[PDB]
Predict the 3D structure of the following.
Amino acid sequence: QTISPYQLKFIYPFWHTFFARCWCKCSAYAWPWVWPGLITFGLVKKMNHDVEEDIRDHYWY
Amino acid sequence: VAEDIGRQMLAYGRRMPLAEFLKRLEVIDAEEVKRVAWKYLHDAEVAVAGLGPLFGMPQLINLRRATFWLRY
Ligand SMILES: CCCCCCCCCCCCCCCCCC(=O)OC[C@H](COP(=O)([O-])OCC(O)COP(=O)([O-])OC[C@@H](COC(=O)CCCCCCCCCCCCCCCCC)OC(=O)CCCCCCCCCCCCCCCCC)OC(=O)CCCCCCCCCCCCCCCCC
């Protein structure tokens, strides 16, 4: 069964089901995308540390 | 004849004689048909029912957008 789109609400059904959809999507992506992201961000910060220490060791008296 | 009498009696409150039907039918021309259709059938809603090997079947939206032509 289908109803003609001229006889349906079409922006209320999207917001009515927003929280469920958003919970599902965000739950699905946490471990696979964010945790490696956090680790990579960590690595960048530690690299910056190493460089800012090098630049003084090598060239400051 | 009896069926026609009763049917018209219920539908109209009277029976319409043959001459009246013919006289009202005579004066309809093409522009009149092309007016009434434009009044009720152009760009309207449609309802659909079907049974059987309906893999071919068109979409509802196809049948509904069919009711107008983009030519003209
Ligand atoms: C870089 C270059 C890129 C170029 C890209 C060009 C893309 C254009 C695509 C053309 C449209 C699709 C055609 C498919 C038709 C299929 C065959 C068919 O059975 O159609 C029946 C259908 C007739 O309907 P029907 O059979 O009565 O029943 C319809 C159904 O009931 C109900 O209908 P339906 O539900 O079955 O859907 C039918 C649907 C079928 O389509 C589909 O189902 C798929 C969707 C179609 C494709 C949509 C994407 C196209 C993007 C459009 C924008 C392109 C801009 C490009 C500009 C380049 C810039 C660098 O057709 C449409 O509705 C198409 C409407 C759009 C076409 C009309 C555009 C012309 C406007 C001109 C204005 C004046 C401008 C002058 C200034 C110069 C501008 C350059 O035919 C059409 O109406 C189709 C269009 C016919 C063409 C008309 C004349 C075009 C010439 C325009 C002027 C040229 C200007 C150049 C001068 C330059 C001056 C410097």
